[PDB]
Subunit: 31 residues, 4 copies
């Protein structure tokens, strides 16, 4: 319940890596 | 409480699909 | 505790509006 | 449990700063 929430939060804290490195893809398409 | 949280987390884990496929829209505007 | 979490989740479900409409800013900079 | 969740939520509410200011990087690459 709480651990299997905190361990969705640590998927989101993956999505906010893959957010960053999407954007840094785009920024290095634009230098 | 916990399930109707985990089931917001599984909306966010939709938003982080629609994040990805927004960016992959942009990347394929830029190839 | 649970309500003042669910009501952070409904800030994030604002950020994922302002995600979308950031990107749709960018897409309509690119048409 | 609940506080060490709410205090992941306040990391995500950092990621959704660094989301915004990524995009505003990109927008000011595009003016």
């Amino acid at each position: 319940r709480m651990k299997x929430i905190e361990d969705k939060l640590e998927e989101i804290x993956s999505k906010x890596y893959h957010x960053e490195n999407x954007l840094a893809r785009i920024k290095k398409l634009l230098x």
